[PDB]
């Protein structure tokens, strides 16, 4: 059993891989609030996500190298998925390019950031 997550903040979409989601699920079993840092390999950018106990994301921000804020986003939508299929169906309907749908479909494992088209 796994849980996939997709977060739309500003006009960007953020894909959260299952393994990370399970780590947050365990952390929130033991605490009330979680601040997770996510590394975007492709663009070499770092982002800090704040989750409540209900696993919605409260705030999204772009971080520097000393956990510093460069840009703040407004969370618009948070969506959860029980299997890869429902994730793929959402991706195909996402307002992204085929090159972005190709990336999200092949890399469930990594923190991925794509832009709205």
């Amino acid at each position: 059993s796994m849980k996939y997550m997709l977060v739309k903040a500003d006009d960007y979409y953020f894909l959260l891989p299952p393994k990370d989601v399970e780590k947050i699920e365990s952390a929130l079993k033991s605490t009330n609030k979680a601040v997770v840092s996510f590394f975007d390999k492709e663009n070499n950018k770092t982002y800090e996500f704040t989750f409540n106990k209900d696993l919605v994301v409260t705030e999204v921000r772009e971080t520097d190298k000393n956990r510093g804020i460069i840009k703040t986003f407004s969370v618009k939508e948070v969506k959860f998925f029980d299997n890869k299929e429902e994730l793929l169906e959402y991706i195909n309907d996402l307002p992204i390019s085929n090159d972005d749908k190709k990336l999200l479909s092949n890399n469930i494992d990594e923190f991925l950031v794509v832009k709205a088209k």
């Epitope: 890869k84 195909n92 085929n98 749908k101």
Partner: antibody, heavy 120, light 107 residues
Framework: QVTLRESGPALVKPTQTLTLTCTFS??????????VGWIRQPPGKALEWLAD???????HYNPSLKDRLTISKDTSKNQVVLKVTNMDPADTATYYC????????????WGQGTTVTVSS | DIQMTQSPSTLSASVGDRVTITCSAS?????MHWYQQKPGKAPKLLIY???KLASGVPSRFSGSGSGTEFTLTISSLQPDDFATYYC?????????FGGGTKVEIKR
């Protein structure tokens, strides 16, 4: 392996409607990411993509064959149907169906193609 | 709409030569895809995602490129390599092919 075979008439009177049928095997158009598309090639000319359908029932068409293309799928029959209205001699070509995937926006496997001539 | 100019239109090379074909796109494209069509037969995927060999295609074939300039290469040209080659993009609808490149063997 994955096999795709196209079937349809070899002769179509002008202004009539061409109906092609792609019967595939080795995959399901119900599996997520899976897609099937149609591509044609007039005698001695370059390939032109025509249409495609996806597992989510999303359909895309070449804006050049406007108001003339319609595609559907029957996952039980494992086949895809393409309908082209108002057939014309410029549409005489070999018609090919092929598989696509959201994972790879390219046609990895093709059918043998069916030749269709528009003539009175 | 992404249009694609393939070059040369025709090419004659001896067996063992190194053949290079170029695809120039009308706009930036993430990946280029190459097909080989012998005459009367259906296209066969040769190189995918710009530089990836399809399964069962000889190592003699390779691809390179980025943005709007892409290339397909044959290290040692073999007699069976007679065909027309097509660069294809799936990065944006409508999907479009190149004009094709006819590769003839000189003997």
């Amino acid at each position: 392996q994955v096999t795709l075979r196209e079937s349809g008439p070899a002769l179509v009177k002008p202004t009539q409607t061409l109906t092609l049928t792609c019967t595939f095997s080795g995959f399901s158009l119900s599996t997520a990411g899976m897609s099937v598309g149609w591509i044609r090639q007039p005698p001695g000319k370059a390939l032109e993509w025509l249409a495609d359908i996806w597992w989510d029932d999303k359909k895309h068409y070449n804006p050049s064959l406007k108001d003339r293309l319609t595609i559907s799928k029957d996952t039980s029959k494992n086949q895809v149907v393409l309908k082209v209205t108002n057939m014309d001699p410029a549409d005489t070509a070999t018609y090919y169906c092929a598989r696509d995937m959201i994972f790879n926006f390219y046609f990895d496997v093709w059918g043998q193609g069916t030749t269709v001539t528009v003539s009175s | 709409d992404i249009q694609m100019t393939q070059s040369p239109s025709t090419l004659s090379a001896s067996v063992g030569d190194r053949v290079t074909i170029t695809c120039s796109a009308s706009s930036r494209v993430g990946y280029m895809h190459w097909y080989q069509q012998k005459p009367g037969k259906a296209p066969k995927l040769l190189i995918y995602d710009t530089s990836k060999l399809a399964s069962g295609v000889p190592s003699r074939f390779s691809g390179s490129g980025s943005g709007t300039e892409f290339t397909l290469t044959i290290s040692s040209l073999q007699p069976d390599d007679f065909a027309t080659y097509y660069c294809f993009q799936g990065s944006g609808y409508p999907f479009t092919f190149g004009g094709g490149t006819k590769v003839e063997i000189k003997r």
